[PDB]
Amino acid sequence: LPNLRVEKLEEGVYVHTSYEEVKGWGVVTKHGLVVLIGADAYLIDTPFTAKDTEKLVNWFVERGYKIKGTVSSHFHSDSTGGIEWLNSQSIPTYASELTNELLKKDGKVQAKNSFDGVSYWLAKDKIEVFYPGPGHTQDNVVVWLPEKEILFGGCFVKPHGLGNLGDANLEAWPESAKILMEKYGKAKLVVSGHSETGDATHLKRTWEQAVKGLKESK
Numbered sequence: 001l002p003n004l005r006v007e008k009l010e011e012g013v014y015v016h017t018s019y020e021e022v023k024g025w026g027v028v029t030k031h032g033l034v035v036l037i038g039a040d041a042y043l044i045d046t047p048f049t050a051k052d053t054e055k056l057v058n059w060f061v062e063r064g065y066k067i068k069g070t071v072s073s074h075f076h077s078d079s080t081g082g083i084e085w086l087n088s089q090s091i092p093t094y095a096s097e098l099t100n101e102l103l104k105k106d107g108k109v110q111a112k113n114s115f116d117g118v119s120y121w122l123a124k125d126k127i128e129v130f131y132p133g134p135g136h137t138q139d140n141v142v143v144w145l146p147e148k149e150i151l152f153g154g155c156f157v158k159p160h161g162l163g164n165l166g167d168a169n170l171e172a173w174p175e176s177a178k179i180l181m182e183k184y185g186k187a188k189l190v191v192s193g194h195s196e197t198g199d200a201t202h203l204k205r206t207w208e209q210a211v212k213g214l215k216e217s218k
């Protein structure tokens with residue numbers, strides 16, 4: 001497998017890409033962000049592993065950044081795998097109350113800090129965690145960077161197909177996607193967990209895929 005990749009998207013915003021061999025299934029490629037605000041770095045999703053979470057943290061700590069906080073966009077291991085390691089390093093971890101409940105139900109380590117607001121703001125006015133409603137999972141949130149007009153759609157944004165529906169809410173996905181398109185249609189870039197970054201048409205495409213997926217299910 002490829003090693004952890006970190007690439008600059010633009011000033012202050014990096015995409016981290018990690019790779020997992022899923023036994024009996026195939027290989028999963030997962031994108032998240034590192035967001036720099038002054039001398040602080042925020043991880044938007046952890047890699048699958050403690051190993052890769054540490055490599056990612058060390059890359060930014062060696063450039064002088066504090067890892068100020070991490071946000072997990074949903075309970076799946078491709079957003080949360082590194083939480084236990086981060087908690088051991090006293091790096092504040094955040095996830096919604098629902099995400100923490102789903103982690104606990106699967107016997108996984110919880111984020112230290114939780115929230116249930118529909119919007120939760122980090123770095124005062126620079127990092128918005130938003131819940132559009134169920135889709136890919138019950139608990140999926142997106143992360144908006146208003147100063148860059150970049151949306152981290154995570155694993156909710158699926159412009160080319162819905163992927164694994166095991167934990168999905170197909171009935172809710174269309175409305176959640178319509179809510180997301182209506183609020184973040186001004187987006188310059190939409191970063192997805194499993195596909196290449198796109199423009200704001202990734203939101204409409206996800207809505208189309210969710211509508212199509214629901215209808216095929218019926």
Ligand SMILES: [Zn+2]
Pocket residue numbers: 074076078136137155
């Ligand atoms: Zn997922």
Ligand SMILES: [Zn+2]
Pocket residue numbers: 030076078154155193194
């Ligand atoms: Zn994912």
